[PDB]
Symmetry: C2
């Protein structure tokens, strides 16, 4: 329903989140992205991985698994 | 040998415009959907085009990968 411009997306992504900065849900998504593509993380990203609150991080990861399931349903029904 | 070199190479490919390998494309679409960030027109156009059977296989590996990450958290003290 909504679209982004390429320029709009690149403004939002910053060098800071290569160092693992950012909100938890954003950080979790970036970690998952690298893992999908088997891309090693940076030390800064890696250091935040141990920092995160496990309870809050687990719930965010479950939401991703749910969203992957929604995408699978979409692709199956086609 | 690098996170940043690998990431910039994919950006140069045009991955934000929808270009690149299917696995790279699916990972980016999944990434945006996780954060509910509106995709680009080029990404959105390919979302309909993609070969569904191969795409579903890629998504199944993502689900297995998300489960592995959940195992890592429980493994930590």
């Amino acid at each position: 329903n909504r679209v982004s411009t390429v320029q709009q997306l690149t403004k939002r992504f910053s060098l800071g989140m290569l160092q693992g900065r950012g909100p938890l849900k954003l950080f979790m998504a970036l970690v998952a992205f690298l893992r999908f593509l088997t891309i090693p993380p940076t030390a800064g990203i890696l250091k935040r991985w141990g920092t995160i609150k496990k309870s809050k991080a687990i719930n965010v990861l479950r939401g991703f698994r749910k969203e992957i399931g929604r995408m699978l349903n979409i692709l199956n029904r086609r």
